[PDB]
Design an enzyme around this catalytic site. Structure first.
Site, PDB file in Angstrom:
ATOM      1  N   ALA A  96      32.226  11.840 -67.701  1.00 23.40           N
ATOM      2  CA  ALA A  96      32.590  10.801 -68.685  1.00 23.40           C
ATOM      3  C   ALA A  96      31.743  10.954 -69.919  1.00 23.40           C
ATOM      4  O   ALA A  96      30.664  11.581 -69.863  1.00 23.40           O
ATOM      5  CB  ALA A  96      32.415   9.376 -68.082  1.00 23.40           C
ATOM      6  N   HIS A 155      26.373   4.081 -66.380  1.00 24.70           N
ATOM      7  CA  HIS A 155      25.758   5.136 -67.186  1.00 24.70           C
ATOM      8  C   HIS A 155      26.310   5.160 -68.627  1.00 24.70           C
ATOM      9  O   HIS A 155      25.536   5.139 -69.567  1.00 24.70           O
ATOM     10  CB  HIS A 155      26.042   6.487 -66.530  1.00 24.70           C
ATOM     11  N   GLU A 156      27.637   5.256 -68.797  1.00 23.48           N
ATOM     12  CA  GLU A 156      28.203   5.364 -70.146  1.00 23.48           C
ATOM     13  C   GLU A 156      27.972   4.067 -70.950  1.00 23.48           C
ATOM     14  O   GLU A 156      27.764   4.122 -72.173  1.00 23.48           O
ATOM     15  CB  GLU A 156      29.700   5.719 -70.114  1.00 23.48           C
ATOM     16  N   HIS A 196      24.342   4.070 -72.251  1.00 21.06           N
ATOM     17  CA  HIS A 196      24.238   4.945 -73.432  1.00 21.06           C
ATOM     18  C   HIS A 196      24.462   4.208 -74.754  1.00 21.06           C
ATOM     19  O   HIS A 196      24.068   4.718 -75.834  1.00 21.06           O
ATOM     20  CB  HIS A 196      25.279   6.066 -73.376  1.00 21.06           C
TER      21      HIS A 196
HETATM   22 ZN   LIG Z   1      24.951  10.644 -70.172  1.00 26.60          ZN
END
Ligand SMILES: [Zn+2]
Length: 866
Positions: A258, A293-294, A297
């Site tokens: 991703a 996770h995304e 970010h």
């Molecule tokens: Zn990453």
């Protein structure tokens, strides 16, 4: 293809502050108009050097003047004689349908989507494709309305209209300056799940998840995980989302897991789509991890980005650390830690012992896409976690606050992040910084001594990192080395010296050092490198009884699992040596008894029991050995499973039955019970054949969820049970139309212990559910064979290497990124015996002579053959 060096970094001669993009979208030919506002920062005679790959240039204007002072070169458009500030306009064409590499703008089924990391935007238009150039984007998209009813880019919709000839258009604006790798564009026809999240300060965020038509039944869990991620980042890190819309698009064709494009993430559908009949507990937990996770970010990557690609770990290590903390806070911290340590020891350590070894901040790169690695991600996260260990949560959060305060809205370096941590905490991290620039796994050797006359316990600790192919020189690191000391009752002995308490995280900073503890009233059993407090190999001369004592008494669940790993390592090593001399398995009775005690322990968390009863994989076992014998490892793993199944048969069946659950729930107590139950099942599959066959076949047929059905199918394959072919055919007949579900079956086919596995794998290249056009299918069949079936990949006749060479000959041309992932097992040749090495060298030499060899493969092959 030329290497680039971290030490060559230089501030750009030009900045672009604002870019206005128009796409006249069409799968065969897309016309891109890009209007950029540029400012010169360098010398007045510096040319503007724009990156571009596979672009058809139509025109160049500067302030609307057709420009004559330019030249195209390899990968570049060099424009000379420019004013200090100007409007650049480029028009160029690209062809999404011809983009089989999946880098830049390409076709995914009927959809068009982008993948711009590390340097994919230069495949869309001529640009300053480097992450220290931050511009405000506005993107207008013009397309056929029937084919592309949804036209998405970063930020907010600010204009829309209709045109003649059945076209429509949408314009998007994203107020945050961004490097171009965070640019995204999606066009297609989707089902959309819509929801909302209200941030702690009251900002309402529209959440929108785009999936292929018909996939809305598989969308709610990812939506739920997104809201969970948002809430957790607020509670843990004090971070809120900063825009009005959060879009996620699930695509079937994607080279990565991703990508975190600002306000418009694009996900491999493997990390979005889940239903209880299609997805396992592990899929659910992976979706949670990657959604988180995304999302994480957005701050660690987007609001503060990377000055250059050598700083990739600055976003990836820190964001992996955040996704691990997310998963661990919401679930079982011990299970998460255990899993991440198995990844470190079994996969990352192998990379650090390979020709591709690199520091978490590399010094030299030929193809940047080769450096999205276990090292940059997983070891990078172990390094952040060591800062957390050294500072503690409060000071660590202070350092995060200072990092964002200083760097919000800019591109930063790993060194900037360490500096913020050091300044906020007043912890000196200058020696610690060496973890960023030194590759390889340190080996920590511990010797101890108990003095009954003085009641002192002394640890003599040393460290060395063996030289790696990239670095002849190695130095001592600042290794946080957590310890705990137990008396014979299992009580923790207070650490102290000279009347003062001593911190249990020791600072191992020298090549050799002694640590002395006073008031040690009884000879201790130590727990060493607690919670894997540094990413190192530990050498300590354990007795079997010290280890079983720890499995029984250690306070942290991790330490109990880890003592079991050390216990197993001894007997895996013994039995591989025996296998090599033609001898059968030998295991002391007291070792099987330690595992019986775990099965019958009423007080042990089933989550922990389950992990202790999951034997190390063949890849984790490989890292115990200087020279890997993958056939002996595979056979020993099976023989150990058979032996434990025989010795523990009754206990295994009792625990299997006691952990039965009629209701299926994606909840951490239920998952733990089911993981234990299925860990018992693995052993039970190796019991008496008729009994095993009945049990496994029954689980497959009565399963009310994919976790239980797959655990059954996997056990039928692993133990080669009579029911195997029937169950595998049943799954195929039920699931062939569903690629993600078929990936599970391709993996089982690829990792099968059957003698005819390669023949089966080659035949499956023609299977209705397989295609070379799809990276997930490739990874599930070919990648799993080469990387997860080393016994068959390393067949003595060299048939595994020849098969991989044929596959890479195709993929080198079709999709170099996937090719480069898949070559990885071949570059580990120096870990194997002489006869294997020469066949692998031969395979690598064949690939090195390929016409149009990609830079991605070139870099790995030349390192492997050095
Ligand atoms: Zn990453």
């Amino acid at each position: 293809p030329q290497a680039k060096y971290r030490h060559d970094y230089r501030a750009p001669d030009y900045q672009i502050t604002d870019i206005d993009l128009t796409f006249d979208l069409d799968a065969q030919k897309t016309v891109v108009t890009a209007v950029s506002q540029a400012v010169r920062h360098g010398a007045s005679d510096a040319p503007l050097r724009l990156n571009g790959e596979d672009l058809k240039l139509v025109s160049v204007h500067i302030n609307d003047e057709p420009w004559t002072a330019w030249k195209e070169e390899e990968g570049a458009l060099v424009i000379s004689n420019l004013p200090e500030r100007f409007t650049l306009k480029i028009i160029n064409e690209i062809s999404p349908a011809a983009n089989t590499a999946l880098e830049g703008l390409y076709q995914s089924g009927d959809a068009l989507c982008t993948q711009c990391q590390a340097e994919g935007f230069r495949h869309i238009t001529y640009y300053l494709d480097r992450p220290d150039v931050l511009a405000r984007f506005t993107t207008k998209i013009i397309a056929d309305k029937i084919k592309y009813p949804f036209l998405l880019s970063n930020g907010n919709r600010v204009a829309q209209g209709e045109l003649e000839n059945g076209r429509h258009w949408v314009q998007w604006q994203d107020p945050f300056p961004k490097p171009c790798y965070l640019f995204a564009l999606v066009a297609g026809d989707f089902d959309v799940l819509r929801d909302t999240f209200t941030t702690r300060s009251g900002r309402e965020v529209a959440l929108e998840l785009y999936v292929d038509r018909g996939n809305l039944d598989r969308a709610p869990w990812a939506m739920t995980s997104l809201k969970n991620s948002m809430k957790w980042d607020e509670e843990r890190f004090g971070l809120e989302y900063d825009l009005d819309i959060y879009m996620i698009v699930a695509v079937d064709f994607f080279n990565m897991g991703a990508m975190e494009n600002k306000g418009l993430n694009i996900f491999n559908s493997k990390y979005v789509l889940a239903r209880t009949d299609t997805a396992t507990d592990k899929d659910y937990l992976d979706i949670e991890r990657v959604i988180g996770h995304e999302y994480f970010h957005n701050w660690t990557g987007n609001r503060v980005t990377c000055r250059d690609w050598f700083q990739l770990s600055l976003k990836e290590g820190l964001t992996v650390f955040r996704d691990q903390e997310f998963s661990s806070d919401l679930g079982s911290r011990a299970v998460n830690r255990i899993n991440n340590v198995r990844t470190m020891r079994g996969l990352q350590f192998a990379e650090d012992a390979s020709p591709m070894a690199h520091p978490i901040r590399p010094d030299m790169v030929i193809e940047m896409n080769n450096f999205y690695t276990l090292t940059v991600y997983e070891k990078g996260a172990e390094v952040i976690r060591m800062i957390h260990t050294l500072l503690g949560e409060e000071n660590f959060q202070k350092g995060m606050q200072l990092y964002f305060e200083r760097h919000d809205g800019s591109a930063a370096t790993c060194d900037d992040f360490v500096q913020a941590m050091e300044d906020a905490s007043n912890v000196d991290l200058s020696h610690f910084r060496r973890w960023y620039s030194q590759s390889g796994t340190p080996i920590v050797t511990v010797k101890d001594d108990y003095n009954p006359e003085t009641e002192q316990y002394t640890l003599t600790i040393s460290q060395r990192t063996p030289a790696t192919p990239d670095q002849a020189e190695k130095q001592p690191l600042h290794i946080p080395f957590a310890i705990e000391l137990y008396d014979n009752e299992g009580k923790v002995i207070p650490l102290q010296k000279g009347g003062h308490p001593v911190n249990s995280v020791l600072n191992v900073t020298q090549a050799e050092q002694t640590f002395v503890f006073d008031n040690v009233y009884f000879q201790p059993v130590p727990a060493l490198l607690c919670e894997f407090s540094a990413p190192v190999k530990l050498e300590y001369k354990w007795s079997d009884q010290q280890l079983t004592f720890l499995m029984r008494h250690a306070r942290n669940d991790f330490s109990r699992w880890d003592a079991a790993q050390s216990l197993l390592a001894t007997y895996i090593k013994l039995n591989v040596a025996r296998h090599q001399q033609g001898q059968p398995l030998s295991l002391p009775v007291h070792v099987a008894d330690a595992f019986r005690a775990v099965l019958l322990d009423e007080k042990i968390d089933p989550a922990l029991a389950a992990e202790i009863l999951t034997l190390p994989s063949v890849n984790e076992m490989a890292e115990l050995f200087d020279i890997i014998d993958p056939i002996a490892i595979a056979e020993v793993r099976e023989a150990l499973t058979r032996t434990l199944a025989t010795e523990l048969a009754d206990e295994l069946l009792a625990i299997y039955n006691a952990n039965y659950q009629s209701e299926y729930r994606v909840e951490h107590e239920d998952i733990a019970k089911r993981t234990l139950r299925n860990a018992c099942l693995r052993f039970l599959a190796f019991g008496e054949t008729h009994l095993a066959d009945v049990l496994v076949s029954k689980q497959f047929h009565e399963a009310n969820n994919m976790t239980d059905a797959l655990a059954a199918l996997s056990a039928a394959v692993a133990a080669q049970l009579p029911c195997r072919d029937a169950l595998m055919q049943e799954y195929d007949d039920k699931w062939h139309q569903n690629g993600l579900v078929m990936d599970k079956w391709f993996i089982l086919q690829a990792t099968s212990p059957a003698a005819n596995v390669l023949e089966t794998v080659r035949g499956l290249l023609q299977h209705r559910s397989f295609t070379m056009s799809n990276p997930n299918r490739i990874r599930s069949l070919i990648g799993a064979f080469a990387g997860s079936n080393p016994a068959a990949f390393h067949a003595e006749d060299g048939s595994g290497y020849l098969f991989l060479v044929e596959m890479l000959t195709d993929l080198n041309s079709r999709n170099p990124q996937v090719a480069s992932r898949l070559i990885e097992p071949l570059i580990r040749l120096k870990r194997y015996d002489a006869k294997r090495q020469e066949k692998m060298r031969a395979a690598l030499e064949q690939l090195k002579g390929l016409e149009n060899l990609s830079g991605d493969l070139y870099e790995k092959i030349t390192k492997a053959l050095a």
